[PDB]
Each structure stands twice: as structure tokens, then as C-alpha cells.
Write a protein that binds this ligand. Structure first.
Ligand SMILES: Nc1nc2c(ncn2[C@@H]2O[C@H](COP(=O)(O)OP(=O)(O)CP(=O)(O)O)[C@@H](O)[C@H]2O)c(=O)[nH]1
Ligand SMILES: *C(=O)[C@@H](N)[C@@H](C)CC
Ligand SMILES: [Mg+2]
Ligand SMILES: [Mg+2]
Ligand SMILES: [Mg+2]
Ligand SMILES: [Mg+2]
Ligand SMILES: [Mg+2]
Ligand SMILES: [Mg+2]
Ligand SMILES: [Mg+2]
Ligand SMILES: [Mg+2]
Ligand SMILES: [Mg+2]
Ligand SMILES: [Mg+2]
Ligand SMILES: [Mg+2]
Ligand SMILES: [Mg+2]
Ligand SMILES: [Mg+2]
Ligand SMILES: [Mg+2]
Ligand SMILES: [Mg+2]
Ligand SMILES: [Mg+2]
Ligand SMILES: [Mg+2]
Ligand SMILES: [Mg+2]
Ligand SMILES: [Mg+2]
Ligand SMILES: [Mg+2]
Ligand SMILES: [Mg+2]
Ligand SMILES: [Mg+2]
Ligand SMILES: [Mg+2]
Ligand SMILES: [Mg+2]
Ligand SMILES: [Mg+2]
Ligand SMILES: [Mg+2]
Ligand SMILES: [Mg+2]
Ligand SMILES: [Mg+2]
Ligand SMILES: [Mg+2]
Ligand SMILES: [Mg+2]
Ligand SMILES: [Mg+2]
Ligand SMILES: [Mg+2]
Ligand SMILES: [Mg+2]
Ligand SMILES: [Mg+2]
Ligand SMILES: [Mg+2]
Ligand SMILES: [Mg+2]
Ligand SMILES: [Mg+2]
Ligand SMILES: [Mg+2]
Ligand SMILES: [Mg+2]
Ligand SMILES: [Mg+2]
Ligand SMILES: [Mg+2]
Ligand SMILES: [Mg+2]
Ligand SMILES: [Mg+2]
Ligand SMILES: [Mg+2]
Ligand SMILES: [Mg+2]
Ligand SMILES: [Mg+2]
Ligand SMILES: [Mg+2]
Ligand SMILES: [Mg+2]
Ligand SMILES: [Mg+2]
Ligand SMILES: [Mg+2]
Ligand SMILES: [Mg+2]
Ligand SMILES: [Mg+2]
Ligand SMILES: [Mg+2]
Ligand SMILES: [Mg+2]
Ligand SMILES: [Mg+2]
Ligand SMILES: [Mg+2]
Ligand SMILES: [Mg+2]
Ligand SMILES: [Mg+2]
Ligand SMILES: [Mg+2]
Ligand SMILES: [Mg+2]
Ligand SMILES: [Mg+2]
Ligand SMILES: [Mg+2]
Ligand SMILES: [Mg+2]
Ligand SMILES: [Mg+2]
Ligand SMILES: [Mg+2]
Ligand SMILES: [Mg+2]
Ligand SMILES: [Mg+2]
Ligand SMILES: [Mg+2]
Ligand SMILES: [Mg+2]
Ligand SMILES: [Mg+2]
Ligand SMILES: [Mg+2]
Ligand SMILES: [Mg+2]
Ligand SMILES: [Mg+2]
Lengths: 205, 86, 392
RNA sequence: AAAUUGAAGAGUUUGAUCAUGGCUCAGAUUGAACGCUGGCGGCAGGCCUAACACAUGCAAGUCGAACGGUAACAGGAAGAAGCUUGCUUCUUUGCUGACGAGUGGCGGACGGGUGAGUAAUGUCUGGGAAACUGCCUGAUGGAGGGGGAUAACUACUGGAAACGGUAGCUAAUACCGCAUAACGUCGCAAGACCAAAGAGGGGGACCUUCGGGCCUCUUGCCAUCGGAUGUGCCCAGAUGGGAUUAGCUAGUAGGUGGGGUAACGGCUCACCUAGGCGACGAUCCCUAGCUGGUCUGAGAGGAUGACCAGCCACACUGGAACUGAGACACGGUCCAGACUCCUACGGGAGGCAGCAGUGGGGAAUAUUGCACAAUGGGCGCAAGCCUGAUGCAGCCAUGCCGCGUGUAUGAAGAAGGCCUUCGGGUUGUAAAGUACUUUCAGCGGGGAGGAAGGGAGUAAAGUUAAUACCUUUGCUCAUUGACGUUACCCGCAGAAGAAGCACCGGCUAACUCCGUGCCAGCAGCCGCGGUAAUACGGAGGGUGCAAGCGUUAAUCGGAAUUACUGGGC
RNA sequence: GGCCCCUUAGCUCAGUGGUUAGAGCAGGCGACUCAUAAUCGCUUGGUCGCUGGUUCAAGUCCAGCAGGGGCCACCA
């Protein structure tokens, strides 16, 4: 129930970096970003409205690494809440455990954080949680178990993390390896490269 | 009957039927005696037949063979008709 | 409901063969009668064996029949076989599970064509021992032609590598023994003694994966499909899980009951002749010639090459060679399948009585492994035998 | 505070146009089935068809504290061999615990299954009066004295069996009169009439044939009036289709009198009157269990009643009553029928739409499993016994949900496939190579919760003549788990054991080469194929979903295409 | 498990042992057409279900098997 194929193809097809590698190297030296994958790569399409809506939805899904059934459940939840559907959907994707573990610089990629969480190396409030989609609430403390403080992966990720823009809703202590929420991010705290109204128009057909 | 509790119930029910039939027969006998005495036209014979009848229906109701309302019905009808004639 | 079967003596499988109307079923009934009279409880009558309506009408044997008896040293399961030339497949299926046969020859007739055919097939299938019983001695009272019959039987047996000068022969009459004549009943006990002494105790391999060749299928009311046969190797326990591997596609099942002569068991070992009750199997889903095996042990195949000998004259055989495109029948265990032949490059004409390396392809898969013996037959004529060499 | 945030179109009639009007597509859902493929777990669900026919084992018993008793078992006693002088053997004893059969009480009308029949004798909503009600509960009363039987048992005897018969004997909370009777019944009154049963524990003093009397405590017994629960009856409105079904009705509509019922009533009879229903759809024909609810929809509506809960009806087919507080009675009785059996030929036996299981029908649907540890039920003062209800386990990708099948780096942009303007492009950081991790599966070691109670002793307070018995409240002491190798935790080795299906002309996301040549073939709708096919078949590349993916069947939406909201001649 | 029937070209059917196994309807090639139908000129075809026997001679006679149809049993 995971995607286990080549990763640069997805960013090539979306025509935009998806932060899907570590970041030690500029992605110009790794793939030819300007081309779509395959034999008919340089050829260009003329997308319709269905095409652009589908591409936007796929791009968000590949960013966060969620499959279609559970994404549909997320949309239904966000539509059930009281507010704006796009804001709720983006905040709801931003609250799952592996995204938070990546977001405070413990894994180099989202798959790093996925394997860290799945292999019983993370605690929330002094309790082991082994599930990626775990929604984390405000005023929660996320930490690495004492048994897992000696791997080189964690400090390599920590050294890759501080050369990146700091999230304004997490508080991190690298020496103790602790992190704490304050509250959920707002729309202005996330990238403006995403139009969620296309998502809503695709799922509210 | 293929369970060793229905056979006992069948035997007991047959005995109880045989027991109840005779009491019902005697009670009906006395009732129709009073009815015949009324039909004849005499008034004293009807009265003494009714006086002989009344304890029988009272006791038979008390033993569960009939209901109190049945005995009261019989007594009421017979009293009404007996006092009707001259 | 049902009683239980207890194991107290070594168990042996025997049976009867011979020409038609020489007295096989009468002997089969007489043995049980006399033994039960002395000790036991068998008492299995003549019409209790030939029970099917056509058998009762035409007065012959069409199927094979199973009876049981026991001397106070052994426990015998006995198989009675037909004697007609066009029931031979049933006789082969019955004789594939014999530890030793009894050859019935009538003194009035002598050896006959079916006697020789049965002897030859017992050679080619692998029956280890043969006892000779000479029947209808009440008819013939001369003591000179009996020598002629005995001699002729002796060289007939010897010609097919069976030990002729050493095999025992018994005179008697099954009709008189069954009637109750105390004089002739001694010959039955002499036959029983030779049956106890000449046949040794065979070896049973009970440390190998379980395997059972299916030979007959029944539907028991209230219970389901039952398959019978003789356990080749291993052990089967109630509750264990089995594989039906054979000429159809493979199936999975579970064992839910084992019995031996209608007596309840709890597990069947090698050498017994048992019926096994399967769970959730329909009666047209299964058939004679399949294999009931331990899962993931044996496999089916269709194409293979082998080493084989061809019979010659004065042995049945053929009086003419064969070439490519030849399609005879191959007998494996309790099965016969048509197959297409491929001779090695060169050596086209095949002499009647040589060896050869041939490749063969079957029309249905067979549960097969190297070092498996088979026979070759067509049109009422046995022609050879071989050993599975390599499987492709 | 919140209990609401609600409505989208596209293809196809023409040389092109506008309108009208049908067909088809994009969504959600299922007791699904088939094809290809398939790692683990949690929670659910699983004969829709033949209410067809059924082998075998289980699904309803319990009380000795109502009774006479002793077939079995264990204790006690008295005679009794032997020696370790009574160690050990034997026999007679219901004396004790207990208890097969028998009389008696209660339960078997509950619990479990199925949807054949039934368009209203049923169901839903709202009301009413002419009634009964075991076990539970409140109040006021009583609870005296007699009798005749019988089962078991003994003797004889019939029958293949199931099962009987004749003669003796005995007990009771079994059965039947008498006495007493009121707020009970009948009657205007005066009056007349009706019932009952004993057992169990302990004991100071007093008489004991010395069995008991006597005191005390507990539980049962009868009558009457209440409470609560259940059940019977009446009325109004609503609850499919057909007018190519328009007339129907003789106990039929009403009245009087006799009977009947727990109770009102043509409920039933005799007589009198001539009425009663119907276009607001009677009568007849077809189909069908009803509801809370379920799917869809912006709503109004449309389709539907599988699992869970309330009501109804049925129990091989057709009738009938008996017993009881309650039945016209799933594992009861009687009679008739068709099937399947046993028989000594005279006669007998049976009913899976209970839980498993078999054959048959079908496109299609599961184990002849474990336990009464928990909840609930029957009997018992209790201990306890019974429970295919129930609690669990097995099978099945049938559905919903969660997780895994590694992770970072890696240009030689390697080999090999494919395309090529012969320069190169693409698969592609993909692989190999390097450095890390160990969830799940495998092996070893620890380890919650589902358990409340019941038993023994002791202490105090109640009761009383009584520190005895009994009840209530505390404490102490040993125990009660089918699931089960539980959930979960700790350690070990190693990337090691784990990815498929549909599609790529437009609708609709995704393009080229070869083979064939209106042939072979494809298709939901328009439509492709006649020698240069993005549409057929294979290959390379790509798109969408993912332990699933496609196809078929069925419903609503789009459909304002039955139009009340909301259409026309 | 036993017994009894059928199998000739693409389709529907003849052919009773004497040696190229035939008829009709269909089909193939050349001229015309972008391609056909029609018109003109030439025409090719079978595993006689398969394997093995008897006969100088087998589609034909004798057996076994494969595929399909129809009757009858046996019940650890
Ligand atoms: N005089 C005599 N007659 C005998 C003897 N044995 C058999 N028979 C006769 O032969 C007849 C047939 O014998 P049977 O035993 O049936 O022979 P079979 O071998 O079973 C024939 P199939 O091969 O079909 O089974 C019987 O009816 C019997 O009367 C014997 O020893 N003596
Ligand atoms: C029954 O199953 C057994 N006695 C025999 C018949 C098996 C061959
Ligand atoms: Mg999933
Ligand atoms: Mg009196
Ligand atoms: Mg003969
Ligand atoms: Mg003979
Ligand atoms: Mg025979
Ligand atoms: Mg004969
Ligand atoms: Mg002869
Ligand atoms: Mg059109
Ligand atoms: Mg056009
Ligand atoms: Mg159309
Ligand atoms: Mg649809
Ligand atoms: Mg399937
Ligand atoms: Mg069925
Ligand atoms: Mg049904
Ligand atoms: Mg008893
Ligand atoms: Mg049930
Ligand atoms: Mg019920
Ligand atoms: Mg119904
Ligand atoms: Mg139902
Ligand atoms: Mg009504
Ligand atoms: Mg008495
Ligand atoms: Mg007497
Ligand atoms: Mg007496
Ligand atoms: Mg009263
Ligand atoms: Mg009164
Ligand atoms: Mg009064
Ligand atoms: Mg008075
Ligand atoms: Mg008085
Ligand atoms: Mg009195
Ligand atoms: Mg009294
Ligand atoms: Mg009382
Ligand atoms: Mg009372
Ligand atoms: Mg009372
Ligand atoms: Mg009441
Ligand atoms: Mg009430
Ligand atoms: Mg009248
Ligand atoms: Mg009246
Ligand atoms: Mg009246
Ligand atoms: Mg119906
Ligand atoms: Mg309801
Ligand atoms: Mg609408
Ligand atoms: Mg809704
Ligand atoms: Mg419903
Ligand atoms: Mg349904
Ligand atoms: Mg059902
Ligand atoms: Mg019934
Ligand atoms: Mg029936
Ligand atoms: Mg039935
Ligand atoms: Mg009936
Ligand atoms: Mg009654
Ligand atoms: Mg009631
Ligand atoms: Mg009943
Ligand atoms: Mg019931
Ligand atoms: Mg039943
Ligand atoms: Mg069943
Ligand atoms: Mg039934
Ligand atoms: Mg079928
Ligand atoms: Mg089938
Ligand atoms: Mg069970
Ligand atoms: Mg029982
Ligand atoms: Mg059950
Ligand atoms: Mg599952
Ligand atoms: Mg277990
Ligand atoms: Mg497109
Ligand atoms: Mg296609
Ligand atoms: Mg081409
Ligand atoms: Mg072209
Ligand atoms: Mg549809
Ligand atoms: Mg509409
Ligand atoms: Mg529609
Ligand atoms: Mg209108
Ligand atoms: Mg219109
Ligand atoms: Mg031209």
C-alpha cells in the first residue's frame, strides 16, 4: 500500500520539485526536470479543465504520500467540519505524524520519517505510537526514544534541517531531541503554490 | 412422546379428564332437574330443586372446575324464572 | 453404533487369480467359513460376495471383492478378482496391492489361457510370491493325471522366473469344504499353514511422507465422499490436511475419518487397506487413479524419458516392430493413460525384445517422480515394462 | 455555544442552423456472482432458489426440606479369618449421608427457527368499556375435626415387541363430606350458600408407653380487597394493481325472548320487521407479512423491508378437543392421508422451517468444534443440577478500516530492449556499488483485564426463657477462565519471507513501431478494418487504481423525460 | 465399474475391398475499380477421428483409445 518506484519521474511529470529527495544536491544534476518522462517527453499537451484539476490533486497527493481512498476520506472530513474546505483539508494533511516528524528535522525525507515512525522510534507524550496517520493535537510533545538516539541518520537530517525555512508553529530542541506544537498552521503559513479550490471542484462535482 | 416428561403429563392429563367429566355431569344433572321442575309449572318443586342445586355450584366453582361468574349466572337466571311464575 | 479396530497381529494382503470357472469365489467363501468355524467371526457366504444383480443373474464375477480373516498369528485382507479376458483392468487394480497370490487351477481342465495371462501380469506388475491350489479333486480320483497337471503348472510358473521347483501345491475341493465335509476341510487348514509360512513378513516404511493411491470412491449418506485404497508410505491422522493430486487440477482437503472393514480407527499406517472420509468434496470431483498425498511433496508431469524393455515371442508380445507415432497405454500404479512415443535419433525399427531409451508424452498429467515402475499394454496384449528415468 | 453549508453538464438527426424529442456517458450504493491476481491484522456479515426429501449425535428438566421406600455407592453397628491379637476376610442391618424406579409439585405456552398463508379477522397513530390474570408485592382474617382408595410392592398370568390382565397390601401437601364464616355470591329486602396442609432447625424447666407434648424461629396453606405485569374485546384515520371486473347480500341488517362466554355482541336458536353495502369504487381477479428504519436526492420525492429491535402467522398434509393461570400446543394426545421403515404376519414406529451434517435445485452461501468462566433462563432453603440461549474458536478478500512489501547515497548517464533525421534520444538514480534500519512474518523469555461471587472460622448487633438455631453487619483463611501458547512488553538473526489489474480515437487522464488488408477481429454511444490503422493483434513507452483490479446483474441521480415545488396542445 | 450408438473438403452429403475418394454450394488467381457486386479468361482442395492387426490388395474387415450421446449397477 505504498509507492516503491522511481521518484524523480513524479516531479518531472508535475514539472515542479516535490522535495522528494534529501536536498544535498540541486536536482538539475540528477534529472532533466524540464521534460515529462518517457519517449514522448519534449512533446507538449493542451490540458483541459479536467486535466488541470487532476494534475493539481495528484501533485498534492504525491507531496504528502497518501493514496486515493484515504485522501477521499480526508476530503469528506474537511467538508464535514465548520470552516473552509480547502483550509481544513490542508490543515488536516499537515497534522499527521510522519509529516510532523519530517517537519521538525528528524528525517531527511517523508519516507525517512515514515520508516522512523513505523519502526518504533518515536514517542508522543511518553507513549510509543507506531502509526503514520496519527493526528497530533496542540500542546503535544514528540520525541525520539532513548534507544534510538545513536543513529547517524537523525543528526544528518538535523544538519540538513536548519538550512531551511523554520516552521513557526513547532518548537524544537535538538540537544534533547524534543518538539512541541503550539497550534495548527494557518493558510498563510504554507506555500501559495497550491490552489485547493481545484481540489474542491474536483471532489464536489 | 419421546421425552421422559411428556409421557407423565399425558397420563396425568388423561386421569384428570376422566375425573372432571363425572363432576360436570352431576352438576348439569342438577341444573336440568331445576329446569324441568320450572317447566312443569309447580312452584314448590322448583324451589326445593334450586335449594338442592345451589351448594353444588358453589363448591364446584370453589374447586376450580368452573368460574364464580358462571355459578352466579346460573343462580341469577334460575331465581328470575322461579319468581316469574305464579 | 460403531465399534473400534484394535491392532494385535501383523497384517497381510492376499488374493485369488486364475482362469474363469476354476473356483475362486467358492474358495474365498470356504476359507472364511472354515476359519470362523475353528476361531473367529467372519462367516461370509457365497451370495454375500457376488452381490450385484448382474453377477447373480449371469453367475460370474465382474468387480473385485474384499474379505477379512485371521489365523492366530496374522490378519489377512483378501481380494477376489475376475477371470474374464475383458475385465482385466479390475484384476490389475486388485493385484497391484497383493503381497502374494493364490493361483487356482482345476484338475479337470489344467492350465488355460487366462491362467497364463494372470501369471504374466503378476510378473509384470510385481507380485512377490505365488501359492498354487489344485481344485475339484473330488471329481478326478485318478492319481496319474494329477502328476501331469502339477508338472505343467510347474514349468508354466518357472518359465516366468517364479520359483517352480520350490513353490508349494495343495490338493482339495472348495465345494466339499464349504458344504462341511470334515475330510476335505483339512486341506483348507493346510493352505492356511502354507500361507502363514511361505509368505514372510514384509517391510513397512512409516517414516516417509504420506501417499495413498485412490482406487474406489463412495458416497456415504449423511457423511459424504469416501475414497479407499492401500497406504503406500507414511501415516495419515484425522484432522490432518491432504492434497488431491492427479490427472485433473490439484485440490486441497482435510481428513475427517479413517476406517478399516467398517471398524473405526484413528490413524492409518503403511500397508493397511483403509477408507478415508474427506471434507467438502463432491463425488464427480474425484476418481480412480488420483493420489492422496501430503501437501507440497509430489507433483504432476506429462513428458518424460525412460529406460524400457520390450517383450518377445513365447511371452505374448508383438510379432512386428513399431516406429514414430506409436500410441500404446501405460499403466502407473492404478491408472492407464495413452501416450505418444519418441524414439532416440536413429534406431528406427524396434526389435521385439530389446532395450531402449524412449521419450513419451501423456495426454493427462500423472503424479510422478524418478524411479517409478510402469507397464505397457495395448489391445489385450502386454508388450513391455520400464522405469521412469528423467522427468521434464 | 453546536446540532448546520444548499442545486454544474457532455456525445449523437443536418451541407451548415435554431427548436422539439428519444437513446447513451461522467456519481453514490449491494446478502452479490464470474475472470485474472493475492502478505498480515481489527470489527462485521454468510441458501435471496426446492415451506424440497432427510442417516446419526446433541437442543428440558428439577425437587428427599410433600411421600412409601432401598436397585446401586459409601459410612455405622453386630456376628467374623488371620496376624503386623482382631492387622485383614466374610455375612445381617435404611441406622446415616445419598439415591434407580414409583406417587406428588413446578416448569414444558419461555427461550430458538421460518415468511407458506394473509390487502385487512393483520400492522401503524389516537382513543374506549363490558373482563380475566401462575410466580412477585400491601392490608385485614382464618388455619377444627373425620373418612374411603391407589401407584410402587407380593403371587399368578398374556405378548416377538410396544405394551397388558387377575388377585392381596400401603403413604402423603394425592382424593372426598362435616363444622365455622364475613367487606364474598344470589336476592328489593327478609334470608339462603361456599374453603383450608403440612414440613424443617434448636432448646432451659415440667410429663413423657417415654415416639411427643411445651417454648421459640423459618417457610409453606385458605378467603376477600388492592398494586404491578401480561392477555382478551370495541371505535376512527391511514396502509399495492386491474372497470377489457358494476352490481353484492338470507343470519344477510335491525328488534324481542331463551341459551352461551372470563366479558359486550347474530356468538347461537325461535319468532317479528325488510332491510344492509356500493362510482368517496362494493363484489371479483392478480400480487404481497407490517413497522422503527435502509439506499438515493439540494429539497419535495423515488426505490426498498437482508443483519438488529416491536407486532403478526406457521410447525409433513387435513380436522378436533383434553389438561392448565395461560395452548386448540416446534422436540404433547386423538382420528384420516401420502411416503419411509421393523415384524414371529397377530401388530407396531416416524416427522431437522432447533444446532451441526447429507442428497437435490442453483450463477451462488460455512464446522457432524470448545465451555457453562461471564450475562440471562427452569427447579431447589441452599449446595447444586440442566441450558446447540449465550460466550468463544474454525472456514470464506463478502464489506469497512489500519499496516507492510525497505531507507539514504549512487553517472559509467553501464549493458540489454525500443525509436532514430544515424548525430543521438529513452527506459533512468532506475539497476549494480556503497552505508543504515528491523515494523509485520520466524525463534526464545516474561505477562494485564474479562472475577462478581460461593465456602470455613470468628466478632458484634438483632430474636427469645435461652449466650442454642436463624438473620444482618465487619474481619480473617484457602480457592473459581472455555478463549489461551490472550492483549501487550523484552531479546535474536538478517533486506532478508511479501504486486497485481484495467486502460491510452472523441466523450476522458495517457503515443509510436511491426503484422494483417471490409479478412481476422473491436464496440457504453458516435463509430474503426477495402495495402502507410494513435480504434484490430504483439512490442516499447505512458495514465489510473492498488491486496485488489475489471466485467455482468439491480436502484436512485443527472431527467424540468408524469412537471405539487416544476411541462405542454 | 458394465453394455450399446455416431465421427468422410470450409458446409450438406455419395461412396458395398481392385488403387490419383467424389457432387453441389462456397473459395483462389488475371483483366476493370480506391475496393467490391455483375460481367470475361484460367482453377486448387481432404490427417476418410487416431494407433495397431488380417489380407496381394483397407474409408470398408478385426481390436484398443479420444470426443459426444443413451441405458444399468456398487455404497468405509
Ligand atoms: N465339484 C466341484 N465344483 C466346484 C468346485 N469349486 C467350484 N465349483 C463349481 O463351479 C461353479 C463356478 O465356480 P466359481 O467359484 O463361481 O468360479 P469362479 O472362478 O468365481 C468364475 P469367475 O472368474 O467369473 O469369478 C460353482 O457353481 C461351483 O458349483 C469344487 O471344488 N468342486
Ligand atoms: C472400507 O473402506 C474398507 N474396508 C475397504 C473396502 C477399503 C478397500
Ligand atoms: Mg486497503
Ligand atoms: Mg350445608
Ligand atoms: Mg470352463
Ligand atoms: Mg472347470
Ligand atoms: Mg468369482
Ligand atoms: Mg457361465
Ligand atoms: Mg470345459
Ligand atoms: Mg440524434
Ligand atoms: Mg454527416
Ligand atoms: Mg444514440
Ligand atoms: Mg450507473
Ligand atoms: Mg473470485
Ligand atoms: Mg438448501
Ligand atoms: Mg429461504
Ligand atoms: Mg430418584
Ligand atoms: Mg439461534
Ligand atoms: Mg417464539
Ligand atoms: Mg409471508
Ligand atoms: Mg425477517
Ligand atoms: Mg382491525
Ligand atoms: Mg388411608
Ligand atoms: Mg382392600
Ligand atoms: Mg388404607
Ligand atoms: Mg367474589
Ligand atoms: Mg353480592
Ligand atoms: Mg346483593
Ligand atoms: Mg341480608
Ligand atoms: Mg344459612
Ligand atoms: Mg362448608
Ligand atoms: Mg382438613
Ligand atoms: Mg397461601
Ligand atoms: Mg391464598
Ligand atoms: Mg384467594
Ligand atoms: Mg390490573
Ligand atoms: Mg395493564
Ligand atoms: Mg332466524
Ligand atoms: Mg340476547
Ligand atoms: Mg340471557
Ligand atoms: Mg408470499
Ligand atoms: Mg418498531
Ligand atoms: Mg432533483
Ligand atoms: Mg443523506
Ligand atoms: Mg426493515
Ligand atoms: Mg433482500
Ligand atoms: Mg435468513
Ligand atoms: Mg402445530
Ligand atoms: Mg415431509
Ligand atoms: Mg419439510
Ligand atoms: Mg395438525
Ligand atoms: Mg380449563
Ligand atoms: Mg394470560
Ligand atoms: Mg410443546
Ligand atoms: Mg416455543
Ligand atoms: Mg423437531
Ligand atoms: Mg440445519
Ligand atoms: Mg418443520
Ligand atoms: Mg448443482
Ligand atoms: Mg456447481
Ligand atoms: Mg460442538
Ligand atoms: Mg442433556
Ligand atoms: Mg446456536
Ligand atoms: Mg481480511
Ligand atoms: Mg485451545
Ligand atoms: Mg486526451
Ligand atoms: Mg481493446
Ligand atoms: Mg501498417
Ligand atoms: Mg489508407
Ligand atoms: Mg446502472
Ligand atoms: Mg424527477
Ligand atoms: Mg437512468
Ligand atoms: Mg403545474
Ligand atoms: Mg414538453
Ligand atoms: Mg482510373
Amino acid at each position: 500500500a505504498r509507492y516503491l518506484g522511481p521518484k524523480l519521474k513524479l516531479s518531472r511529470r508535475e514539472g515542479t520539485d516535490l522535495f522528494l529527495k534529501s536536498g544535498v544536491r540541486a536536482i538539475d544534476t540528477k534529472c532533466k526536470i524540464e521534460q515529462a518522462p518517457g519517449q514522448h517527453g519534449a512533446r507538449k499537451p493542451r490540458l483541459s479543465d479536467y486535466g488541470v484539476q487532476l494534475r493539481e490533486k495528484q501533485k498534492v497527493r504525491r507531496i504528502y504520500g497518501v493514496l486515493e481512498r484515504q485522501f477521499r476520506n480526508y476530503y469528506k472530513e474537511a467538508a464535514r467540519l465548520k470552516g473552509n474546505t480547502g483550509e481544513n483539508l490542508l490543515a488536516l494533511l499537515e497534522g499527521r505524524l510522519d509529516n510532523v516528524v519530517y517537519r521538525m528535522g528528524f528525517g531527511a525525507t517523508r519516507a525517512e520519517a515514515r520508516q522512523l515512525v513505523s519502526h518504533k522510534a518515536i514517542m508522543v507524550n511518553g507513549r510509543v505510537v507506531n502509526i503514520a496517520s496519527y493526528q497530533v493535537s496542540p500542546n503535544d510533545v514528540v520525541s525520539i526514544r532513548e534507544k534510538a538516539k545513536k543513529q547517524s541518520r537523525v543528526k544528518a537530517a538535523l544538519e540538513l534541517a536548519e538550512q531551511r525555512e523554520k516552521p513557526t508553529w513547532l518548537e524544537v530542541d535538538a540537544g534533547k531531541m524534543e518538539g512541541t506544537f503550539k497550534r495548527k498552521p494557518e493558510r498563510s503559513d504554507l506555500s501559495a503554490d497550491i490552489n485547493e479550490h481545484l481540489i474542491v471542484e474536483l471532489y464536489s462535482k | 412422546a419421546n421425552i421422559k416428561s411428556a409421557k407423565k403429563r399425558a397420563i396425568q392429563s388423561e386421569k384428570a379428564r376422566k375425573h372432571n367429566a363425572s363432576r360436570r355431569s352431576m352438576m348439569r344433572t342438577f341444573i336440568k332437574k331445576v329446569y324441568a321442575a320450572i317447566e312443569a309449572g309447580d312452584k314448590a318443586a322448583a324451589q326445593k330443586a334450586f335449594n338442592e342445586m345451589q351448594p353444588i355450584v358453589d363448591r364446584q366453582a370453589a374447586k376450580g372446575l368452573i368460574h364464580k361468574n358462571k355459578a352466579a349466572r346460573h343462580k341469577a337466571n334460575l331465581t328470575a324464572q322461579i319468581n316469574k311464575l305464579a | 453404533s460403531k465399534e473400534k479396530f484394535e491392532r494385535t497381529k501383523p497384517h497381510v494382503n492376499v488374493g485369488t487369480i486364475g482362469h474363469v470357472d476354476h473356483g475362486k469365489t467358492t474358495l474365498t467363501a470356504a476359507i472364511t467359513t472354515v476359519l470362523a468355524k475353528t476361531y473367529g467371526g467372519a462367516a461370509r457366504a457365497f451370495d454375500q460376495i457376488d452381490n450385484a444383480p448382474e453377477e447373480k443373474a449371469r453367475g460370474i464375477t465382474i468387480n473385485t471383492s474384499h474379505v477379512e480373516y485371521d489365523t492366530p498369528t496374522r490378519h489377512y485382507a483378501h481380494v477376489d478378482c475376475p477371470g474374464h479376458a475383458d475385465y482385466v483392468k479390475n484384476m490389475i487394480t486388485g493385484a497391484a496391492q497383493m503381497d502374494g497370490a493364490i493361483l487356482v487351477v482345476a484338475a479337470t481342465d489344467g492350465p488355460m489361457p487366462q491362467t497364463r495371462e494372470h501369471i504374466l501380469l503378476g510378473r509384470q506388475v510385481g507380485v512377490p510370491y505365488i501359492i498354487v491350489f489344485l481344485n475339484k479333486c473330488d471329481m478326478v480320483d485318478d492319481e496319474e493325471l494329477l502328476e501331469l497337471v502339477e508338472m505343467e503348472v510347474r514349468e508354466l510358473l518357472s518359465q516366468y522366473d517364479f520359483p517352480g521347483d520350490d513353490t508349494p501345491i495343495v490338493r482339495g475341493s472348495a465345494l466339499k469344504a464349504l458344504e462341511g465335509d470334515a475330510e476335505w476341510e483339512a486341506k483348507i487348514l493346510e493352505l492356511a499353514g502354507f500361507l502363514d509360512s511361505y509368505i514372510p513378513e514384509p517391510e513397512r516404511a512409516i517414516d516417509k511422507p504420506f501417499l495413498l493411491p485412490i482406487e474406489d470412491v463412495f458416497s456415504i449418506s449423511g457423511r459424504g465422499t469416501v475414497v479407499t485404497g492401500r497406504v503406500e508410505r507414511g501415516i495419515i491422522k484425522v484432522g490432518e490436511e491432504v492434497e488431491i493430486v492427479g490427472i485433473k487440477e490439484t485440490q486441497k482437503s482435510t481428513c475427517t475419518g479413517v476406517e478399516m472393514f467398517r471398524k473405526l480407527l484413528d490413524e492409518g499406517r503403511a500397508g493397511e487397506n483403509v477408507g478415508v472420509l474427506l471434507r467438502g468434496i463432491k463425488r464427480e470431483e474425484i476418481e480412480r487413479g488420483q493420489v492422496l498425498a501430503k501437501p507440497g511433496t509430489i507433483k504432476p508431469h506429462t513428458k518424460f524419458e525412460s529406460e524400457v524393455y520390450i517383450l518377445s515371442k513365447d511371452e505374448g508380445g508383438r510379432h512386428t516392430p513399431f516406429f514414430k507415432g506409436y500410441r500404446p497405454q501405460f499403466y502407473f500404479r492404478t491408472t492407464d493413460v495413452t501416450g505418444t512415443i519418441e524414439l532416440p535419433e536413429g534406431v528406427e525399427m524396434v526389435m521385439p525384445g530389446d532395450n531402449i531409451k524412449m521419450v513419451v508424452t501423456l495426454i493427462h498429467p500423472i503424479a510422478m517422480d524418478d524411479g517409478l515402475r510402469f507397464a505397457i499394454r495395448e489391445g489385450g496384449r502386454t508388450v513391455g515394462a520400464g522405469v521412469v528415468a528423467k522427468v521434464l
